[PDB]
Amino acid sequence: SMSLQVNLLNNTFANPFMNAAGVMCTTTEELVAMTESASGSLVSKSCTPALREGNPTPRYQALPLGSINSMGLPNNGFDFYLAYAAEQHDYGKKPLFLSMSGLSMRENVEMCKRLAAVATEKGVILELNLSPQVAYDFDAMRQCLTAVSEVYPHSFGVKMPPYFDFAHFDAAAEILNEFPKVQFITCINSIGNGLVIDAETESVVIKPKQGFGGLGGRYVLPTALANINAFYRRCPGKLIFGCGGVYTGEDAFLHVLAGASMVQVGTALQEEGPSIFERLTSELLGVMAKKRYQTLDEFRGKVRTL
Amino acid sequence: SMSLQVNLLNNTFANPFMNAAGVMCTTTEELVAMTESASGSLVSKSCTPALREGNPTPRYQALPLGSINSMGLPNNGFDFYLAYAAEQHDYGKKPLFLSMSGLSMRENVEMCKRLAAVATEKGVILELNLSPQVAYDFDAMRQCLTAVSEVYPHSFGVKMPPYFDFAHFDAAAEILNEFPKVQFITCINSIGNGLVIDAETESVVIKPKQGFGGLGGRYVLPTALANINAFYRRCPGKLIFGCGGVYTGEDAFLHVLAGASMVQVGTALQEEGPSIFERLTSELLGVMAKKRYQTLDEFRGKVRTL
Ligand SMILES: Cc1cc2nc3c(=O)[nH]c(=O)nc-3n(C[C@H](O)[C@H](O)[C@H](O)COP(=O)(O)O)c2cc1C
Ligand SMILES: Cc1cc2nc3c(=O)[nH]c(=O)nc-3n(C[C@H](O)[C@H](O)[C@H](O)COP(=O)(O)O)c2cc1C
Ligand SMILES: Nc1ccc(-n2cccc2)cc1
C-alpha cells in the first residue's frame, strides 16, 4: 500500500501536487476548480496591493517544449485573495497557499501585516514571490525578507527564480538560511526573458517586452531539478517545493528525487486544466509502484551522484 | 540567386555556420575535419596556458532535448592551438577563431600577448570565453576585458553566458560597449548548472559537480535567441554570433532573424559530426528559398515584434 501524503507546516497534503502560482488561480472560479481538483494543494495568483490588468495580449503562448509568457501580474489584488483565504476557501478540502508579489518592500510589508491575522485564524500559507528581480539582487532579497520577517509572525516560503551558478546557489542559500521563518523554497519561477521566434511569421509570439518572456514546461525541467537539488542540499532546515517542467508522474518523481516536498504544475496545467491532477497522482503512484516505493519520504532528495 | 556569404572582421565566410567552441575542435584531426567541412568557419577548443585532462567521465550526455556536460576545459593547451593557427590552418579554406579560457586574468593576458603576433601574421580571431563565472561577475568581466584590451592589439569577440534579466542585459551591454576592440559577442554558452536526472537509474547522468552541468541543444534555443537579440539591440556597434539550439536550417534562420551574423553549432554537431554543415547550409538555403530571401542581410535582426 502506497501514499502520496506530504506532511509540512502542521498540514497534511493528500499528494504533493498543486498549481504553480499564476496558473488557473486568478479568479474565484479557478480557485474553486483548484480546490475541487485532485491536487494536494493550490496557490492563489501572485497578488499586488491593488488589482492589475497585466500586460497587453498576446502575453502567453503554449509551445511544443513548454510556454513563454509576459503576463505582467494580472491579479484581482490582495483584498480579493485575502477574502478568498479568510472566508471562501474550504480548508477541509486542502491547505491553501497565497502568493504575494508586492512591487516594493513596503507593499509586501503592508500586505503581510494584514495576512498575519488570516494565516493565524484560517492557516493560509504565504508563498512570497521574489521572482534586476529581487532574488538576483542578494542585498535587496535580504532586505525584503528582513522587512517581511519583522511584521509577519508566521512560517512562509519564497518563490525563487532559477540560478545557474554555484556561487549564486551559495549566496542565495546563505541569505535564505538567515531567515528561519522561510520554511520552504519554491524552485523555480520561469527561466526569465527567453525569446520565442515563430519561423513562419518571422515574429515573436508575445506582445510585451519585444517578445521576451518567462519560459516554462519542458525547457525548464533540468534547471528546475538543479535549483530544487541545490537548495535541498544548501538549506537542510527548509523544504523545497518543485516547480518547472512537470507534465507526468515521472517528472514529479524527478522533482521529489531532487528534493521536492510539494510539486507545482504550471504550463502542463495551463494546457490540460485541473483534471491533470487525477492523471499526475495516478502516474506518480504508477511510477512508485514500478520502482517499489510506498511513500515520497523513501526517495525524496535521494538522487544518486556518480 | 542565393548566398549564405557573410562579410565581417575583414573576412569572407562562405556561410555563417561554424562549430561552437569545445565541440569537435580539441584535436588536430577535429580541427582538420572542421576545416574540411562545409562550415563557413571554425573555433578551436577553449584553451588554458597548459594542457588540461578536464573533469572525470562521464562528463557529457546527449539527451532527447539536447545535452548536459561538465567537460572541465579538457584541451591541448594554448601552444597547441596557437601552433595550429600559426603553422597548420589553411586560411585559404576558411577563417579561424581561437577560443581562450584562461583560469585567471593573468593567464588570459599571457596567452593574448603571444596570440598578438599570430593574429597579425595569420589572421586567427580571438573568441575570449567569459563563460561566479566571469560574465556573471560584472567586475570580473570588466577586469578581463580591460586586461585583454590593454595587451591584445586586435579586435576580438567574447563568448557570453546567457542572461535572464533586462538589468543584466543592460549591465553586460554597458560594459561591452566600453571596449571597442570587442567587435563580436557570441550568445550563448550553455545554460549553466542544469541537473539531468535519469528516472530509470534515479541518478544524475554526469560525474563532475554532483551531476550539475551546462545545458545545450533544444533546451537553450529561446534563451539563445533572447541573448542574441538583446545584445544585437544593445550593442549596435558589434556583431552577434548565435550559439544555442541549432539543429536545422530553420533554427539557424531564427538565430539570424534575432541578429546573428555567424551561427555556431554545439550539441547537434557533437551528435552528427561535421557532415552536419552540408545539411545545415542546404536546409538554411531551402528555408530562404521558401521565404524568397537571397541573402542573410535581408532578414538579419529583422524579427518582428507585436
Ligand atoms: C501564465 C503563467 C503565469 C504565471 N504567474 C506566476 C505568478 O503569478 N507567480 C509566480 O510565482 N509564478 C508565476 N508563473 C511561473 C510559474 O509559477 C512557474 O514557476 C513556471 O511556469 C514554471 O513551471 P512550469 O514549467 O510548470 O510552467 C507563471 C507562469 C505562467 C505560465
Ligand atoms: C562538449 C561541449 C564542450 C564545450 N566546450 C566549450 C568550450 O570549450 N568553450 C565554450 O565557449 N563553450 C563550450 N561549450 C558550449 C558551446 O560552445 C555552446 O555554447 C553550447 O553547447 C550551446 O550550443 P548548443 O545548443 O548548439 O550545444 C561546450 C559545449 C559542449 C556540449
Ligand atoms: N550579479 C548577478 C546576479 C545574478 C546573475 N544571474 C545569472 C543568471 C541568472 C542570474 C548574474 C549576475
Automatic annotation (TrEMBL), chains A, B:
One of its GO terms (cellular component) is ciliary plasm. CDD domains: DHOD_1A_like. Residues 4-288 form the Dihydroorotate dehydrogenase catalytic domain. Fumarate binds at residues 45, 72-73, 129, 189. FMN binds at residues 21, 45-46, 129, 159, 188-189, 217, 243, 245, 266-267. Pathway: Pyrimidine metabolism; UMP biosynthesis via de novo pathway. One of its GO terms (biological process) is 'de novo' UMP biosynthetic process. Orotate binds at residues 45, 69, 71-73, 129, 189-190. The modification Cysteine sulfenic acid (-SOH) is found at residue 144. It is found in: Cytoplasm. Keywords: Cytoplasm, Flavoprotein, FMN, Nucleotide-binding, Oxidoreductase, Pyrimidine biosynthesis. It catalyses: (S)-dihydroorotate + fumarate = orotate + succinate. One of its GO terms (molecular function) is dihydroorotate dehydrogenase (fumarate) activity. Belongs to the dihydroorotate dehydrogenase family. Type 1 subfamily. Catalyzes the conversion of dihydroorotate to orotate with fumarate as the electron acceptor. Molecular oxygen can replace fumarate in vitro. This is Dihydroorotate dehydrogenase (fumarate). It comes from Leishmania major.
